[PDB]
From Swiss-Prot, chain A:
Record annotation: effect of changing L125A: Slightly reduces activity and reduces protein stability
Outcome of swapping D103N: Reduces activity 4-fold. Reduces activity 10000-fold
Any one GO biological process: steroid metabolic process
Cysteine disulfide links: none
Pfam families reported for this sequence: SnoaL_2
Organism annotation: Pseudomonas putida
Catalytic activity from the UniProt record: a 3-oxo-Delta(5)-steroid = a 3-oxo-Delta(4)-steroid
Protein name: Steroid Delta-isomerase
Amino acid sequence: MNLPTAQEVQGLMARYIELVDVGDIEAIVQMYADDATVEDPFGQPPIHGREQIAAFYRQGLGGGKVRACLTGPVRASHNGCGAMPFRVEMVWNGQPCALDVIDVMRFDEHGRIQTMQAYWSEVNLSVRE
Amino acid sequence: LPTAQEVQGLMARYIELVDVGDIEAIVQMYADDATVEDPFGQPPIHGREQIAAFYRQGLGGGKVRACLTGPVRASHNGCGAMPFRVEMVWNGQPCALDVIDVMRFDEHGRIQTMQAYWSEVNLSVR
Ligand SMILES: C[C@]12CCc3c(ccc4cc(O)ccc34)[C@@H]1CCC2=O
Ligand SMILES: C[C@]12CCc3c(ccc4cc(O)ccc34)[C@@H]1CCC2=O
Ligand SMILES: [Cl-]
Ligand SMILES: [Cl-]
Ligand SMILES: [Mg+2]
Ligand SMILES: [Mg+2]
C-alpha cells in the first residue's frame, strides 16, 4: 500500500494491538519501517531501527502475561497518522494490573510505521484495591 | 515543566471549559507563539486572535458538549494525550465525533502545542 487512507490507518492500528495482545513480536516488528523510531514512554530516549525495536518488544512482551485491548476508536487523519486509546493488562508485584495508554503513529508511503510515540506514565497504572 | 498529575489537571480543565463554551478562558490557557493543529494534517493556526477565531467559530453557537471518554495519559516531560467525544449539530443532523488531542505544556503551564487527531471517519450520526 500506498500511504494509508484514514480507513487504512484505522485497520493498521487495530491490527497492531491484536499482535501485541496475541505477543507476536516478529509480526509487530514487520509492521514497522526498517528505520522506524519508538518513543515508549514518551519522554524516554527513542529506540531506532528494526533490531532495536524487536528487542524492545521482546523485553516488554517476551515474558508473556501481557493482553492489550482498545478502549475506544482509532482516530485517523489525512496525512497518514492515527491515535488510539488502549489498556494493557499484565503483572505488577505478582497481581494483575493495568496501564491505560495512547499511541500515536505516523506511517509511510509504503504503509509501514515510521514513528510511534506511546503516552503514559505511573498515573495510568492501576491495581485492585 | 508541569508534573504528570498536573497534566492530568490542565488537560481535564481544558475539556471542562470546551464543554461549557468559554472561549476567552480556553484562549488564556495557551502560550505565546502556541500552535494549534487541528485537525492534524491541516497547517497550524498561530496567533493569539486567530487561536480565538478558531474556538469562535467552533464553538460560539453555545451548542457544542465535550466530554472525556477515558483518562488523560501524561508523560513526565509536560505532555499528555486524551480521548474525548464532541457532540454537535451539523446542519440539522445530531452528530458525534471522536477525538484525541495531544498537548505539550511550557514551564509556565500554558499550551504550547495542541494536535487534534480526527476525521471524517470519526463522525457518527447519533
Ligand atoms: C511493557 C508493558 C506491557 C505492554 C505495553 C506497555 C506500555 C506501553 C505499550 C505500548 C504498546 O504499543 C504496546 C504495549 C505496551 C507496558 C509497560 C509495562 C508492561 O508490562
Ligand atoms: C469544531 C467542532 C466542534 C469542536 C471540536 C471539533 C473537533 C476537534 C476538537 C478538539 C478540541 O480540543 C475541541 C473542540 C473540537 C469539531 C469538528 C467540527 C465541529 O463542529
Ligand atoms: Cl474513546
Ligand atoms: Cl481510554
Ligand atoms: Mg486478541
Ligand atoms: Mg523508508
